[PDB]
């Protein structure tokens, strides 16, 4: 069968295709995929700049473009990161595509907004979503420079619309930075615990929430994501072995 077996466009060429698929299986396994989520006022558009140590520019948002694939690496481990772009608020549809991901990163302006309650309703929707049941959430309480300024200035209003802050008190879990005020520490940990109160209520060991505190300029977001995927991956390998 010379017309079926030839090397230019027939079955021997159709074997040379599998060399590329064998070389490409490898990069798809090696790279980690990270869905990026949160509100309009979230600062995640600043976070992707903190993620980028690439000298070459990357095409993100551009007119009606629908997803902002972004690339970075830590310790020679590659990360592909996806801020979902120009899309509607019907997220139960486009979220099905992300059943594959290594983790979600959920980014919140932790900055004493009334809208913090919408971020809590969204995290409750996302944490419990039927497509996301195995997918860990890394959680960024962002802009806590602004939280510190607002609370230190005494112009914070958190009890006035979260009517349990006055009853809540700082847990022995709390490890604050040197010189942080008792009100600032109580406020950041209360906002942290309000998310953990959603995450522990149904996080029965399928998936884990990794809360972090972060600001408009810190360099440690790339490391926080590297450290947290390293915990997620080792948990997945222990489960693959049936050893956990």
């Amino acid at each position: 069968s010379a017309e079926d077996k030839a090397a230019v466009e027939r079955s021997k060429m159709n074997k040379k295709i599998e060399k590329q698929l064998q070389k490409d299986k490898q990069v798809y396994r090696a790279t980690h995929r990270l869905l990026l989520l949160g509100a309009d006022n979230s600062g995640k558009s600043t976070i992707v700049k903190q993620m980028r140590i690439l000298h070459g520019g990357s095409g993100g948002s551009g007119g009606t473009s629908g997803i902002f694939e972004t690339k970075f690496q830590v310790d020679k481990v590659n990360f592909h990161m996806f801020d979902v772009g120009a899309q509607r608020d019907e997220r139960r549809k486009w979220i099905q595509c992300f059943n594959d991901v290594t983790a979600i990163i959920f980014v919140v302006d932790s900055s004493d907004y009334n809208r913090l309650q919408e971020a809590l309703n969204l995290f409750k929707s996302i944490w419990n979503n039927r497509w996301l049941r195995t997918i860990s959430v890394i959680l960024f309480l962002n802009k806590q420079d602004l939280l510190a300024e607002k609370v230190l200035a005494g112009k914070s209003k958190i009890e006035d619309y979260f009517p349990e802050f006055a009853r809540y008190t700082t847990p022995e879990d709390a490890t604050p930075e040197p010189g942080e005020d008792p009100r600032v520490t109580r406020a950041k940990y209360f906002i942290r615990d309000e998310f953990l109160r959603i995450s522990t209520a149904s996080g029965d060991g399928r998936h884990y929430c990794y809360p972090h505190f972060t600001c408009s300029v810190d360099t440690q977001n790339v490391k926080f994501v590297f450290d947290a995927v390293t915990d997620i991956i080792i948990k997945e390998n222990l489960k693959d072995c049936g050893l956990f």
Partner: protein, 338 residues
């Protein structure tokens, strides 16, 4: 004026419902209660296609009933010879998040798209030995959900912006834009005369569209949840929809009302994909439970199962001669059933 408009709309809806009820005189099941059932369809996996790195999300047949295209969330758009089970092309996509692909009727071009909102056109017949993007279509807002060539120059699409649009490939400018869905549009099918298309959306509605006119002819709201899947009946006068409510409804355009419903009490999962076989008697649907149920279209009964995937059957389709079914799945295989 708003109250008057609402009253007029309610009156029009009531009149349409009354007309549909009057047109209803005998149910399809009662009329078809005398024809013998198809019996238990048994299918076997004649071939398995292996090489996608990730979740297969769409597939389409070439018109020859032998070439097959499939798309996967790794961003590969593989073309397979079905008969020999080997890879004719392995087109690398510019976007990983490919929710749809299409085969041109002439087999010269393939389309695909997804969360990038761009419908890329790839030309298979080129002087050089490597495939290249003939044209990139932009203008849709939100994800591209389904796409289908009408010819080598006209391609129709649906999207997250709740629109469908007709694109002229050569010029790259929309020829007509079809709007009226409130929800995101999830799927398309083109009537066999290539004169109409039907689309289903997250608002649970289906709409029929006149392509030479740019206007909606009929609307249906039988489903109570978001419609994922839609396909045309071979006769072209009816279509079947697939929603997360674990039910399929067949609508007759001439009757402008539902005729039969396909659902089982043992199914508590949504439907990903639907297609008819060539005669239209046998309906095939993919489900979230990891298998595809066959059905009799003319008699609601789950008359067979295609089972063997480790994960969600995301896509399926029947060849133009009826001599295979393919199903793709989130376990990165395609199985050919015959």
């Amino acid at each position: 004026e708003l109250d008057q408009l609402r009253q007029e709309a309610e009156q029009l809806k009531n009149q349409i419902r009354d007309a549909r009820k009057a047109c209803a005189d005998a149910t399809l099941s009662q009329i078809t209660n005398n024809i013998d059932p198809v019996g238990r369809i048994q299918m076997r996996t004649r071939r398995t296609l292996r090489g996608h790195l990730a979740k297969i999300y769409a597939m389409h047949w070439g018109t020859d009933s032998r070439l097959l295209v499939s798309a996967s969330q790794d961003g590969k758009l593989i073309i397979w010879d079905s008969y020999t089970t080997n890879k004719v092309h392995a087109i690398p996509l510019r976007s990983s998040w490919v929710m749809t692909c299409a085969y041109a009727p002439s087999g010269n071009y393939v389309a695909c798209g997804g969360l990038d909102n761009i419908c890329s056109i790839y030309n298979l017949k080129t002087r050089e030995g490597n495939v290249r993007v003939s044209r990139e279509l932009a203008g849709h807002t939100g994800y591209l959900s389904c796409c289908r060539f009408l010819d080598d120059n006209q391609i129709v699409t649906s999207s997250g912006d709740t629109t469908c649009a007709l694109w002229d490939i050569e010029t790259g400018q929309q020829t007509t834009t079809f709007t009226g869905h409130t929800g995101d549009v999830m799927s398309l099918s083109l009537a066999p005369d290539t004169r109409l298309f039907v689309s289903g959306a997250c608002d649970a509605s289906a709409k029929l569209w006149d392509v030479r006119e740019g206007m909606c002819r009929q609307t249906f709201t039988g489903h109570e949840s978001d419609i994922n899947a839609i396909c045309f009946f071979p006769n072209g006068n009816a279509f079947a929809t697939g929603s997360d409510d674990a039910t399929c409804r067949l609508f007759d355009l001439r009757a402008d009302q539902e005729l039969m419903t396909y659902s089982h009490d043992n199914i508590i999962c949504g439907i990903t994909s639907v297609s008819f076989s060539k005669s239209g008697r046998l309906l095939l649907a993919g489900y979230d439970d990891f298998n595809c149920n066959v059905w009799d279209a003319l008699k609601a009964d789950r008359a067979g199962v295609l089972a063997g995937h480790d994960n969600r059957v995301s896509c399926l389709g029947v060849t133009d001669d009826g001599m295979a079914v393919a199903t793709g799945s989130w376990d990165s295989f395609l199985k050919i059933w015959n």
